[PDB]
Paper text:
Several studies revealed that SmAPs from different archaea bind to oligo-U stretches of various lengths.
The crystal structure of Sso-SmAP2 was determined at 2.6 Å resolution. Sso-SmAP2 possesses the classical Sm fold, consisting of an N-terminal helix and five strongly bent strands forming a half-open β-barrel. The major structural differences between both Sso-SmAPs are found in loop L4 and in the N- and C-terminal regions.The extended N-terminus of Sso-SmAP1 forms a protrusion on the L3 face at the proximal site that results in the formation of distinct grooves between the subunits, whereas Sso-SmAP2 displays a smoother surface due to the absence of the N-terminal extension. Interestingly, the corresponding region (Thr40, Asn42, Arg68 and Ser70) of Sso-SmAP2 displays modification(s). Thr40 replaces His40, which is responsible for stacking interactions with the uracil base (magenta). In fact, the methyl group of Thr40 protrudes into the uridine-binding pocket, and thereby most likely interferes with uracil binding. In contrast, the L3 face/proximal site of Sso-SmAP2 is significantly more positively charged due to the presence of Asn7, Lys10 and Arg13. Sso-SmAP2 is predominantly negatively charged, which is effected by residues Asp26, Ser28, Tyr30 and Glu50, whereas the presence of residues Asn29 and Lys30 confers a more positive charge distribution in Sso-SmAP1.
Numbering used by the authors:
A (entry chain D): 4 to 82
B (entry chain C), C (entry chain B), F (entry chain E): 6 to 82
D (entry chain A): 7 to 84
E (entry chain G): 5 to 85
G (entry chain F): 5 to 87
The structure:
């Protein structure tokens, strides 16, 4: 079957991803929805700071605007 | 399962709207457009943690173009 | 529903406009537009947080793409 | 509608504020749907005053960078 | 009357001034423009507060119209004062 | 003759991506498309001149509209 | 005489300067171009303000036309002041 960047976004549904917006902020959540424009819907969204033991704020269920995203960590693994 | 009807399901509830400014706002969502244009009843700007209320704007119309994200169920307390 | 119809209901009233640079402007709304191009009267710039006019501009055509939000029902005084 | 309010001020002085917050005045000649303007005798005046900074002559201002345009400057004369 | 792009198109073979989004100004001799306000200038040099300096020569440059604040189409008349 | 068809010659290779943040990231390019969206494996953030990584993000989807330039083969050897 | 984007294609194999919106300048030898001003460069070297002194080597880069301020076509001869 096919493989394209945007399909790989659609395959990350129901798993834990990191989204980095353009302001430099990073939010971890359980990916639930996507679209072509990269509009995300996440569950248990938590802002984090790199370094640090992850969370610094919780936002619950969040609709993210694809226009403002820099990248998406498709399968975020803490090791 | 569209990312947008999740938004329009959140109408009549209290939402958090963050903008590129890092500016966060909280208010009862009334109306919603496909380009994520927003109207909020009782929209008070809140700093992050802080104190919360910073400025009370009443009913605001928010351009969708300038939004980072929207916490659709921001009765997260 | 439709968020921009909420803009045609503020005409001939005072509104507050937050622009992208963060500067705020009060004035009386006259005409509107699809691109949220606004025309205000007695428009005075006020500084972030306060109600103090630091500059008055009179009748002002505002470009819509540079607007953060519009406080539609700025009675709240 | 707004963009015909703009044409009211043809051959009259308007004030234009760009995204970087720099303000410019000059006599409006020509406009279009994206608010691309043409001004004569363009100057930088400094905010609050009408004391020039830089003269620029006839200028074409790209519309997307415009914060606002005060079409009825020159009545701020009063 | 009117069509802002036209005043740009009659400015060919003239000395113009371009203020870009980075906030810097340049002068040069205009040579090619299009509908997207893309500019081709000769003898381009960065520009200042008053008269006009030669801070940095960039020669023959193509200027992407999407990042231009404005263009002064008769700048020679200006620095002829 | 096409700038983008030089990008797809870099798949499975290590490239450097500088976002508009100025922030730069190295990683094995896996997937691309016409919008210059990229998928990197072992995406790590770097500071030019230094050896230590700023952050590890693993397999990353990079949105194409926020990229400055792609070093479509970082031969640092 | 002709059309801006096309004058960019007469600059293939030349040393050109590219300034991005952030303000950083890069020097390299132009390979491939398209309508949206997307570029491919060899010898891509970031140079410091106005000078011709290298600060970072990037080799072959695909540059996004969206983020360009300008392109100094044939930049080679424009190295009078130094080298």
């Amino acid at each position: 079957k096919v493989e394209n960047p945007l399909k790989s976004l659609r395959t990350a549904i129901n798993r834990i991803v990191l989204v980095k917006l353009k302001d430099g902020s990073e939010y971890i959540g359980k990916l639930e929805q996507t679209d072509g424009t990269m509009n995300l819907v996440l569950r248990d969204c938590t802002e984090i700071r790199e370094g640090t033991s992850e969370p610094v704020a919780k936002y619950g269920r969040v609709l993210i605007r694809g226009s403002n995203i820099l990248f998406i960590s498709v399968d975020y693994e803490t090791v």
